[PDB]
Design a protein around this nucleic acid. Structure first.
Ligand SMILES: [Mg+2]
Ligand SMILES: [Mg+2]
Ligand SMILES: [Mg+2]
Ligand SMILES: [Mg+2]
Ligand SMILES: [Mg+2]
Ligand SMILES: [Mg+2]
Ligand SMILES: [Mg+2]
Ligand SMILES: [Mg+2]
Ligand SMILES: [Mg+2]
Ligand SMILES: [Mg+2]
Ligand SMILES: [Mg+2]
Ligand SMILES: [Mg+2]
Ligand SMILES: [Mg+2]
Ligand SMILES: [Mg+2]
Ligand SMILES: [Mg+2]
Ligand SMILES: [Mg+2]
Ligand SMILES: [Mg+2]
Ligand SMILES: [Mg+2]
Ligand SMILES: [Mg+2]
Ligand SMILES: [Mg+2]
Ligand SMILES: [Mg+2]
Ligand SMILES: [Mg+2]
Ligand SMILES: [Mg+2]
Ligand SMILES: [Mg+2]
Ligand SMILES: [Mg+2]
Ligand SMILES: [Mg+2]
Ligand SMILES: [Mg+2]
Ligand SMILES: [Mg+2]
Ligand SMILES: [Mg+2]
Ligand SMILES: [Mg+2]
Ligand SMILES: [Mg+2]
Ligand SMILES: [Mg+2]
Ligand SMILES: [Mg+2]
Ligand SMILES: [Mg+2]
Ligand SMILES: [Mg+2]
Ligand SMILES: [Mg+2]
Ligand SMILES: [Mg+2]
Ligand SMILES: [Mg+2]
Ligand SMILES: [Mg+2]
Ligand SMILES: [Mg+2]
Ligand SMILES: [Mg+2]
Ligand SMILES: [Mg+2]
Ligand SMILES: [Mg+2]
Ligand SMILES: [Mg+2]
Ligand SMILES: [Mg+2]
Ligand SMILES: [Mg+2]
Ligand SMILES: [Mg+2]
Ligand SMILES: [Mg+2]
Lengths: 272, 101, 88, 72, 119
RNA sequence: UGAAAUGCGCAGAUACCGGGAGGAACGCCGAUGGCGAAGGCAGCCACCUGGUCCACCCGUGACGCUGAGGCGCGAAAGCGUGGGGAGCAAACCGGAUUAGAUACCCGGGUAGUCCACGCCCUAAACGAUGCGCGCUAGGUCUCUGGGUCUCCUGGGGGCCGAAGCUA
RNA sequence: UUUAUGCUCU
């Protein structure tokens, strides 16, 4: 669910928080397998290269396991489900029979205390990782690799997933969370199930400050600027765009496509 | 527990060796969900009225069983996981209804 | 469903005497069994209103009896309830 | 108009067994439809039992769902 | 791009027109015609005579690539059906069979207001 | 289509074949039938579950009937949050018709139609016939139980009708 | 597939 508040202040009236009942003995995280210190910095070497960032709560980085072939065959028990501030999804601490501990992005359903495993073997149930080629066509899946052995990249956002649609050569055909139909190599690992914490999309920040906590500084409209600053600056009492709506740097921002045309990747795609 | 007849249609192009492979998992899954077999009728290949999986023919299997009813649904889901298992119809057993007699 | 010996168990346990297969309590108790069953079914299948209808009927019936019993014998009313956990 | 009611065309059959085609495939038409009561000679109760099973067989792949009208 | 003896004939018969495509044994159309190809516009094409004229222009072009036998297949009601079936037989092409494959849903998509009427 | 026009099509359409995607509805059976208190319920399978009838005459011993309030359910449309969207289709655009045509016919087409959850509480929600019980000729058709299985008996669904009722 | 309409009191 999602937590609501009686309006005992404005903003608290619309404010809505995440449900943390799914969260098992978190609080203190697992200092070992993560965390590392997280270098919080809003610009590159010198200059701001992404506007409107900075501030917001300090964070410890949980170094999660986005490649599971690392431990083929070795099963493991799910010890806890934890809060991770560095992603929308929740994380699951799992103890391997090895005695090795690793975090995984907690899939929807994944219960505390169940066994998990990865490999060409691997029962087709929730939490288990397999090379795409060995997953029954039609199953939903998450944390997919885009190229073999390069680590998961796709469907890692809270509530996201991907469907295996068919096979074609050493490639299988996924339908990515974006809706794009893509061919991915069969050797690429995926893990069965959707991501979970899917109520995520339904929280309401409620106030300006709430955005400040997440590290988002106020965003100012070109419309409020001067010509020096933005295509939309200037006028003299409000103003339509007076030209095709543009970004501070001049390019159009309503329709104009941006994907590089001649791109090797193009040969493996087929949708929106 | 209840008596269910269990119909399973398999890929016809499988070889006698594979066919046994696909048939051992059935039998284990059958046992893992709590089914105690009774009869059995492996009519084998059979001509189909319409192509299932683009294959005019299909290899048939038929089991009578007594399993806990609260696990029949799950069983069917499991039996179907195989690609060489192209259809399953679990049906609760019935005393035959006769005519002309 | 409530199986034969399953309901038999109850019949015997409440019978006012070996042979009693439909006294006030044996009925009340009997109903109580189905009610608690359905009540747990509806908790799961809540958009199943038709079945909930019967529930009301089984509940209403049970009440009528208990009102009769508490009218004729205010003793085995406490007794019956206490033993069943009813009237909240 | 003519022909027999069919029920009087075969001996003692189990119209609950959805597996024996030959008995059943005679209750279908040229095109493949379930035959009306006025040609199966079955009763109210028997016609339901029949269809219910005729459907099952179809799913199984034994009985057809439809077939073309031959030589019109 | 070839000359094949054994073939297959298709009759599409709608209220508004009749169109006949003649295919190879595999279904690949060898040549086709319709009420409009004959020379008619408007509703003249929905005629049984337009269907006849049509099915002949079909067969005639078929025999060009060497067409002898067909397995005539009709789809859809309409005034084209029979006259189109007849016409074929009455010129070269021996009709090895006459199948009716007019597609019908087991209650699939809702139809247009026009073809629904009752409930 | 009445006839057409808009529309689509030599940028390869319609017709035909093979592959794939996706949504919705379930042909024959099917009935003038069945079930439900009503709204209403129709491919198949399994699980959970309500009502109901019959046979036996076994148990309680009037424990009944109705029911102002209350509570629950309540077609379609409609509303909120998500999803879903193939066909259809208010609105809207275009083509025709006409004196005009914001319609009727045609080509497009968005909400909606579908799912989850939560609201809305309407209706020719109709048998325009509140519920329970006893009493007052029969004929025939049908569904479904039991029968000493031509006939009898119980519960339903129809028609014709004694007596009586009715403008 | 083209039509709509018929003043007031008797
Ligand atoms: Mg720099
Ligand atoms: Mg530096
Ligand atoms: Mg520097
Ligand atoms: Mg958001
Ligand atoms: Mg702003
Ligand atoms: Mg300014
Ligand atoms: Mg400056
Ligand atoms: Mg400028
Ligand atoms: Mg400007
Ligand atoms: Mg101004
Ligand atoms: Mg026409
Ligand atoms: Mg076809
Ligand atoms: Mg053109
Ligand atoms: Mg044009
Ligand atoms: Mg060209
Ligand atoms: Mg096609
Ligand atoms: Mg009824
Ligand atoms: Mg009705
Ligand atoms: Mg029942
Ligand atoms: Mg007695
Ligand atoms: Mg006594
Ligand atoms: Mg009052
Ligand atoms: Mg309510
Ligand atoms: Mg409603
Ligand atoms: Mg509605
Ligand atoms: Mg809506
Ligand atoms: Mg919506
Ligand atoms: Mg218009
Ligand atoms: Mg106009
Ligand atoms: Mg004028
Ligand atoms: Mg008019
Ligand atoms: Mg229209
Ligand atoms: Mg349309
Ligand atoms: Mg609105
Ligand atoms: Mg009311
Ligand atoms: Mg009504
Ligand atoms: Mg009135
Ligand atoms: Mg009445
Ligand atoms: Mg009343
Ligand atoms: Mg009955
Ligand atoms: Mg009988
Ligand atoms: Mg009667
Ligand atoms: Mg009458
Ligand atoms: Mg009279
Ligand atoms: Mg006037
Ligand atoms: Mg007048
Ligand atoms: Mg006037
Ligand atoms: Mg006057």
């Amino acid at each position: 669910a999602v937590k609501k508040f009686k309006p005992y202040t404005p903003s608290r009236r619309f404010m809505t928080v995440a449900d943390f009942s799914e969260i098992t003995k978190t609080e203190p995280e697992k200092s070992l397998v993560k965390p590392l210190k997280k270098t919080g910095g809003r610009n590159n070497q010198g200059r701001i290269t992404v506007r409107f960032r900075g501030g917001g709560h300090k964070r410890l980085y949980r170094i999660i396991d986005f490649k599971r072939w690392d431990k083929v065959g070795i099963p493991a028990k799910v010890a806890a489900i934890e809060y991770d501030p560095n992603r929308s999804a929740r994380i699951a601490l799992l103890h391997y029979v090895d005695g090795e501990k690793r975090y995984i992005i907690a899939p929807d359903g994944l219960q505390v205390g169940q066994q998990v495993v990865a490999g060409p073997d691997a029962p087709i149930q929730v939490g288990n990782a397999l090379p795409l080629r060995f997953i029954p066509v039609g199953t939903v899946v998450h944390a997919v690799e885009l190229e073999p052995k390069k680590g998961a990249k796709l469907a890692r956002a809270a509530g996201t997933s991907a469907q295996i649609q068919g096979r074609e050569g050493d490639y299988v055909i996924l339908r990515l969370p974006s809706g794009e139909l893509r061919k991915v190599h069969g050797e690429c690992y995926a893990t069965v199930g959707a991501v979970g914490n899917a109520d995520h999309k339904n929280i309401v920040l409620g106030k300006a400050g709430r955005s400040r906590w997440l590290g988002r500084r106020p965003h100012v409209r070109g419309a409020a600027m001067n010509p020096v600053d933005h295509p939309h600056g200037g006028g003299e009492g409000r103003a339509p765009r007076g030209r095709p709506p543009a970004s501070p740097w001049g390019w159009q921002t309503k329709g104009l496509k941006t994907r590089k045309r001649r791109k090797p990747s193009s040969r493996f795609i087929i949708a929106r | 527990m209840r008596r269910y007849e269990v119909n399973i249609v398999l890929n016809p192009n499988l070889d006698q060796s594979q066919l046994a492979l696909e048939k051992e998992i059935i039998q284990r899954a059958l046992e893992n969900y709590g089914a105690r077999v009774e009869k059995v009728e492996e009519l084998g290949l059979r001509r189909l009225a319409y192509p299932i999986a683009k294959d005019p023919q299909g290899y048939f299997l038929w089991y009578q069983v007594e399993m806990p009813e609260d696990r029949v649904n799950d069983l069917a889901r499991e039996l179907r996981i195989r690609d060489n298992v192209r259809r399953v119809m679990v049906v609760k057993s019935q005393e035959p209804f006769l005519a002309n007699a | 469903p409530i199986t034969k010996e399953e309901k038999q168990k109850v019949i015997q346990e409440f019978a006012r005497f070996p042979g009693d297969t439909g006294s006030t309590e044996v009925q009340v108790a009997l109903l109580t069994l189905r009610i608690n069953r359905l009540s747990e079914h509806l908790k799961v299948h809540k958009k199943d209103h038709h079945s909930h209808r019967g529930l009301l009927m089984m509940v209403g019936q049970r009440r009528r009896l208990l009102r009769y019993l508490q009218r004729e014998d205010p003793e085995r009313y406490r007794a019956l309830i206490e033993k069943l956990g009813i009237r909240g | 108009s003519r022909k027999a009611k069919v029920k009087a065309t075969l001996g003692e059959f189990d119209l609950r067994d959805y597996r024996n085609v030959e008995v059943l495939k005679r209750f279908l038409s040229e095109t493949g439809k379930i035959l009306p009561r006025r040609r199966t000679g079955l009763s109210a109760k028997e016609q339901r039992i029949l269809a219910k099973t005729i459907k099952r067989a179809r799913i199984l792949g034994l009985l057809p769902f439809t077939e073309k009208l031959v030589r019109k | 791009k070839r000359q094949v003896a054994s073939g297959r004939a298709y009759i599409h018969a709608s209220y508004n027109n009749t169109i006949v495509t003649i295919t190879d044994p595999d279904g690949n159309p060898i040549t086709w015609s319709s009420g409009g190809v004959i020379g008619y516009k408007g509703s003249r094409k929905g005629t049984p005579y337009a269907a006849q004229l049509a099915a002949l222009d079909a067969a005639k072009k078929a025999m060009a690539y060497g067409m002898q036998s067909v397995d005539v297949i009709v789809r859809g009601t309409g005034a084209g059906r029979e006259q189109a079936i007849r016409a074929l037989q009455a010129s070269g092409l021996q009709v090895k069979s006459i199948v009716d494959d007019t597609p019908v849903p087991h209650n699939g998509c809702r139809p247009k207001k026009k073809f629904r009427k009752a409930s």
